[PDB]
């Protein structure tokens with residue numbers, strides 16, 4: 124028997140399709156996991172192959188919570204620490220944000236989704252320490268989910284990284300994974316710092332996870348990620364009435380075998396709830412929206428919202444706070 128939950132699978136299907144239509148997008152995917160077991164409660168694609176497991180993307184901004192996770196886990200950075208977030212140079216290259224903040228603390232980097240900040244956090248570690256970390260989240264590794272065509276994604280060896288590549292990788296370019304690997308990766312945040320295996324089958328035994336960061340770190344990062352959906356953050360479109368939601372937006376220019384083209388984007392929105400004691404991850408990706416803008420927030424936010432809200436209703440999770 125499958126872990127799939129028909130009500131949720133139906134909900135995801137309806138909501139994905141409304142969005143991919145509304146935004147005149149080329150393709151789309153939604154994945155819902157059990158946050159505490161890695162079971163796939165829903166997995167849905169626009170008609171065609173199972174993109175959620177066969178296709179690989181650059182995570183972009185959705186990678187940022189891990190870089191922060193790693194920094195805090197190390198003991199070398201505390202959430203309250205301030206960083207100069209102005210544009211800067213890695214030799215011949217320039218790291219910069221869309222909107223420029225002189226300084227941010229770690230919560231601001233998460234909230235405002237700053238490349239500069241994220242790359243400074245990364246810059247505090249070796250090529251090897253960051254590759255080992257990405258590797259332990261499952262980037263470049265086979266999940267063994269049993270789906271046909273399962274990509275392992277792409278993690279180039281640290282042994283051949285320029286300094287610019289360490290940076291661009293810390294904020295999600297240069298490495299690749301499936302939306303399902305990405306959702307799986309978030310089990311580190313939701314399952315108290317342990318990476319769960321994913322499954323399309325009901326587990327008789329509750330599955331064990333491999334430890335990657337401490338529980339207290341996961342706990343703190345979840346707290347920080349709530350900033351994304353509160354006023355001031357990139358991801359307010361994904362707030363759900365009656366709950367705190369940890370989420371991360373991602374808006375990426377499209378890598379088309381080699382070159383970045385800048386009038387083409389991929390919108391991804393991923394998060395969990397209840398933020399303090401999470402039950403589900405929802406990951407949404409929409410490929411190349413043409414109509415009504417391209418920001419994660421506008422495109423994938425509403426679908427995240429509906430699916431998360433509907434998912435916690437269906438599983439019978441009680442609101443943690445009164446409905447507005």
Ligand SMILES: *[B@@]1([O])OC2=C(C([O])=O)[C]=[C][C]=C2[C][C]1[N]C(=O)[C]([N]C(=O)N1[C][C]N([C][C])C(=O)C1=O)C1=[C][C]=C(C([O])=O)[C]=[C]1
Pocket residue numbers: 183184185221236238291296357371372373374375376377383418419420
């Ligand atoms: B990220 O995705 O978070 C984010 C959001 C969000 O959270 O939804 C919204 C606006 C900006 C950002 C910053 C992050 N995205 C980008 O930096 C993105 N940049 C890229 O796609 N690339 C690809 C190529 N390389 C390596 C060669 C890069 O370093 C790079 O920057 C970006 C930049 C500008 C815009 C835009 O149209 O304003 C969108 C996305």
